[PDB]
Amino acid sequence: LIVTQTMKGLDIQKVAGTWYSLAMAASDISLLDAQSAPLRVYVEELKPTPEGDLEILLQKWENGECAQKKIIAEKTKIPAVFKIDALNENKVLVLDTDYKKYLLFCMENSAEPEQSLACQCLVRTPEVDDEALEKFDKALKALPMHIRLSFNPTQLEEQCHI
Ligand SMILES: CCCCCCCCCCCCCCCCCCC(=O)O
């Protein structure tokens, strides 16, 4: 609920398939600065269940190499918001998507201390999409980000964007 842009009328079935993590931003540099930083995750695929939960396939660098990870995001009463559960119960919020080209999401830790908030611009192809990046940057202008990364088409085709 730090982020107050939410996709009205989200049809979670339609975000299925392959995505590319074109850009990332976080409120804390340490969340994204190294290959093995904790929210440096490269989205591969979204797999919505029939009950409306969301299976997530991603990569993450750990122990000197690019590892595949599977993650379950459970639905809530709000169609745009999901919970990772696991250790801290992180919420994931879909800000905006048009399903066939881009999707903007943010995630926050359900409490703090020092605020942890990270967002991504996903796109459907290995292409720099200026319009989506522009919407991403607009979405974030009033959020307190201190690190922003983006990736070139070559990196997007490589595991962990190396
Ligand atoms: C509805 C659109 C939603 C798309 C965006 C997905 C959001 C990704 C959130 C990723 C945070 C989790 C941090 C990485 C944990 C590694 C995994 C450890 C393991 O299970 O072995």
Curated annotation (Swiss-Prot):
InterPro entries per record: Blactoglobulin, Calycin, Lipocalin, Lipocalin_CS, Lipocln_cytosolic_FA-bd_dom
Tissue specificity statement from the Swiss-Prot or TrEMBL entry: Synthesized in mammary gland and secreted in milk.
Known partners and oligomeric status: Under physiological conditions beta-lactoglobulin exists as an equilibrium mixture of monomeric and dimeric forms. Interaction with LMBR1L which mediates the endocytosis of LGB has been observed in PubMed:17991420, but not in PubMed:23964685.
Family the UniProt entry places it in: Belongs to the calycin superfamily. Lipocalin family.
Lineage: Eukaryota, Metazoa, Chordata, Craniata, Vertebrata
Cellular localisation: Secreted
UniProt xrefs under CDD domains: lipocalin_beta-LG-like
Function statement: Primary component of whey, it binds retinol and is probably involved in the transport of that molecule.
Primary location class: secreted
PROSITE patterns xref list: LIPOCALIN (PS00213)
Keyword Transport: yes
Record-given protein name: Beta-lactoglobulin
Intrachain disulfide bonds: 66-160, 106-119, 106-121
